[PDB]
Amino acid sequence: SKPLAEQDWYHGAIPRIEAQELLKKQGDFLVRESHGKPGEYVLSVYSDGQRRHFIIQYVDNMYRFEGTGFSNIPQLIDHHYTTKQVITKKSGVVLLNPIPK
């Protein structure tokens, strides 16, 4: 229930092109507010030599990727960061390095 603005890895409204400069090594990640899909949040990660951008789905009052839903984004991100569960089956992405704001 801790706020996004107090998380080291939350970068607010930085655009995709700026996230590119910040994501450089396997498992680097940050969260930002989408421009292409206004009102949505994005988990941006560096994995296998590429930047990958996942919409954090918000459905029925829950934030999720492909599995468990949580009431808030910090709980979802912390879950993946501590358990190393992949973001999606297709991507196999594992969060390793929170990129500080």
């Binding site: 292409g36 899909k37 990958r52 996942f54 919409i55 789905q57 999606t88």
Partner: peptide
């Protein structure tokens, strides 16, 4: 721009 899951 492309998003992985949307």
């Amino acid at each position: 721009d492309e998003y992985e899951n949307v």
